[PDB]
Amino acid sequence: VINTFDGVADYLQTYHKLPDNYITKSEAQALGWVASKGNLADVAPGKSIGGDIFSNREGKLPGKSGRTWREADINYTSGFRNSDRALYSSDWLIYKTTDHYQTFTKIR
């Protein structure tokens, strides 16, 4: 696998977790992923980067007391990471970005 904007959006809102094909960046690193060589598909077959906390430093996403944001890679299959991300909050607001977190649009 589930790695589309709608499939992961709907899965979160429901199971309140990412599907089984997602791993955090530090877990990928441990398995041998080196960002510079784009080898995630070779060291972690069928997995995608997801579940890491996203700072929202630039305040581009809506803030709230106790609200925390996480990101997940969307549409990834192999090679270097793409520019598509699903941003999800602890209270289940879902935003999408297709331009490396420059802009955001509400999806759930």
Curated annotation (Swiss-Prot):
Annotated active site: 71 (proton acceptor), 100 (proton donor)
Keywords: Endonuclease, Genetically modified food, Hydrolase, Nuclease, Secreted, Signal
Source domain of life: Bacteria
EC number, UniProt record: 3.1.27.-
Coiled-coil segments on the chain, per record: none
Keyword hit for Mitochondrion: no
Subcellular localization: Secreted
A single GO cellular-component term on record: extracellular region
Single GO MF annotation: RNA endonuclease activity
UniProt family annotation: Belongs to the ribonuclease N1/T1 family.
Protein name: Ribonuclease
Organism in which the protein naturally occurs: Bacillus amyloliquefaciens (Bacillus velezensis)
